[model samples]
Target: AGTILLDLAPEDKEYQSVEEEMQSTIREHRDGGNAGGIFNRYNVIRIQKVVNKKLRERFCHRQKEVSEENHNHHNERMLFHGSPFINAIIHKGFDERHAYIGGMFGAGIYFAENSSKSNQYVYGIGGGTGCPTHKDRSCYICHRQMLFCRVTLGKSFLQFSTMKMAHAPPGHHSVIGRPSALAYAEYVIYRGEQAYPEYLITYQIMKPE
Candidate 1:
């Protein structure tokens, strides 16, 4: 029988906070008659605050330094739709068998491409096996399979974050499962309009040992 690994749904408070902030920011912009306003100040500020809070509460080691680093990374990586705060979470726990780290690591996600077959697409996390199981072989075009996704130095934070597994900490509910990587990538992509900024880049996937 197939065994279950991790099944973590993003924390509702965190998720809802982002969602509400987005809505409010957009609404404020529209109300000001700048439907295509350049600033999403509300959400941006709120996200920064939320991210900072998470790091301090969790990391707590020289919280000020970590917070500043996260802010700096966020400012630098915002150009590419990457989240430095999220990256910090992963690297800090990758070496340790921390359950929270293990859950958030979000390993097994892959972005792949094929010339003679389907175009590029992001694949969600499955067990050690790559790609989801596809029973129907009809119309399937086979091609060379690549594993890594190229990311800028700022974005490389994802590499560290995605290589470990996270767990639920005391007083916190941790639901572990598949598809988080896909969802996470989607959030990053959504931050941009139309398409992912060219800056997001790509690379070959290095399977976690």
Candidate 2:
């Protein structure tokens, strides 16, 4: 195998508990807009081994003095993001293969502090979405996926405008898109060790009538 995927299997009860909480986060992000899809909780697979100590040690380089005073716990946080390529991510982990990718901020591995914002990046199956609506408005239904990850939000830049950058602006460790009128934050991290894909939660989107 190219990369090892050792499931850090958690008990079903605990996993289910996490699933419920994850669902609530996405729903709450909607600000109690229950008019949207059901967003049922599905699977929460525990994963590990996408981490590299060497890269993580490198991340420490950012933690060391010389940058600035970012008196936070390395400013690490639990965040969300998604991609349909389960194996590509689960097995190998995230990479910064920019491809000159059209990220509004720039080319880097990005995760969302706002769960709902990442929802748009994934597509699911067996749903009422992406099809013609029925007469009864039978409520749209579908499946979707999200990765609940632990990411380091170091001395990040509050990027007010879009710029194609391969590295953090001098003295910054990450990039966060600016907010205007209640928008979510998109965290762009450059290196590998700065992230850990901890939970993969797959869910269904069903319109609640």
Candidate 3:
């Protein structure tokens, strides 16, 4: 089966570019009050399965059709989703139901602009620390993963308050949450199919290279 996870070589030119982008995205927000520091120079994984690739292709095609209204960016962005269940996500696509109750935005899947916000959700032991199922034994050296997704925010709506939203407002493809009280901006996608999990970053807390 082609549903295997492919680890991207760090030395590869393509990986460097992807890693650079991840760094820049983190660096751009570090100066902010809540958006914090960088990630370790680590490994990136490509989800090479067929179903997801095709779904993403279809999503992009539909997104592009409305690119004109979305300021021509296809409303596309590279965002991160941090979770202990990242493996489940890679195996299947993102599931909005997983984010239903405790999420700021109701049933939608959340993506973060800053690595810090995403990183908080990642906990497990590089040998990783905060894994949900593992609590008895401990390891000092830890690592966790977050997905770098290509999100299509066709027409983004900036919401001032945190509402238990079931759907985006009319004509809006997504919601834009700007930093308030020690909060970083987050993009919320109402549907699971609106984004593609492009890369998975396996990294440490702060050992940046």
Candidate 4:
């Protein structure tokens, strides 16, 4: 992108293509232009063509068209970038594979974190039921998925949450798992700060059924 800009506006031109465009945009914006969206929002320059004897509007129209096109393109990129909906579409055929791949990494990290031999059971992360909607699912009780083991510290538990929302798949009855539950077993906690209570220490290993 930078190279293209430099080629479009050589050093001889007071400013490079992108810089001139930006300057023009900033000027217009400062002057209170009402245009909204990326072109108006991001493109910095307005191109005009004045021939030796004639003033041409064609260049302006063409530039406007280019700006509109770029704006639309940028909008699509922004719309899809980091969005689950976009991910679903792009990875539709391999969503399960990606999820499982993620699970593999998640499990690996959990084991690394709780490697102490004395700590028989480590607290696994928490769970989240929501699907990955536009909202950050990690903010919910699904910070991460981690394999856990119980220890003598009275069921030492690790809690995690999501930063996004996760809605169930359209018309699907079964949920994969709460975003956090994939690694950690189920454990209950009250809504607020006072979740820790009196529980006897018992190290136990529960195998997957």
Q: Which candidate leads the pack in TM-score?
A: 3
Candidate 4: TM-score? 0.14
List TM-scores for all candidates, in order. 0.18, 0.64, 0.72, 0.14
Clashing pairs in 3: 123-130, 124-128, 124-129, 124-130, 125-128, 125-129, 126-142, 126-143
lDDT of 4 at 203: 16
Off by over 4 Å in 4: 1-8, 17-21, 24-35, 38-49, 52-209
Looking at candidate 1, what is the lDDT of residue 66?
29
Using lDDT as the measure, which candidate wins? 3
Predicted candidate 2 versus true structure: per-residue lDDT over 58-137, tens digit per residue: 44565443234565447777787665454566545566673226777677777776565566555322121422333121
Candidate 1 lDDT over residue span 1-209, tens digit each: 11111222335464354334333322222123111112222222122211223223333332333235445342221211212122332223111221122233432221212111111222211211223354212112221121111211122223223334332223221122233333223112101111111111122222122
What ranking of all candidate models by TM-score puts the best one first?
A: 3, 2, 1, 4
lDDT of 4 by residue, 1-209 (tens): 01111112235353353233332322212212111111122221222211211112322333344345444221100000011222221212112222212332231111211112112111211212222342222122212111121111112224354212132123221121232534322222111110111111111221122
lDDT (tens digit, per residue) of candidate 3 on 1-209: 12445666767776777667666665333433122224443334342312356556556776776586666766688888777677777667666667645666677888887765676556531222344454411212445567778888888888756777888888778888877653578889887767777787776455444
Residue 3 lDDT, candidate 2, scale 0-100: 44
Candidates 1 and 3: which is better by lDDT? 3
lDDT of each: 0.23, 0.57, 0.64, 0.21
Which scores greater on lDDT, model 1 or model 4? 1
Model 2 lDDT on a 0 to 1 scale: 0.57
What C-alpha lDDT, on a 0 to 100 scale, does residue 79 get in candidate 1? 18
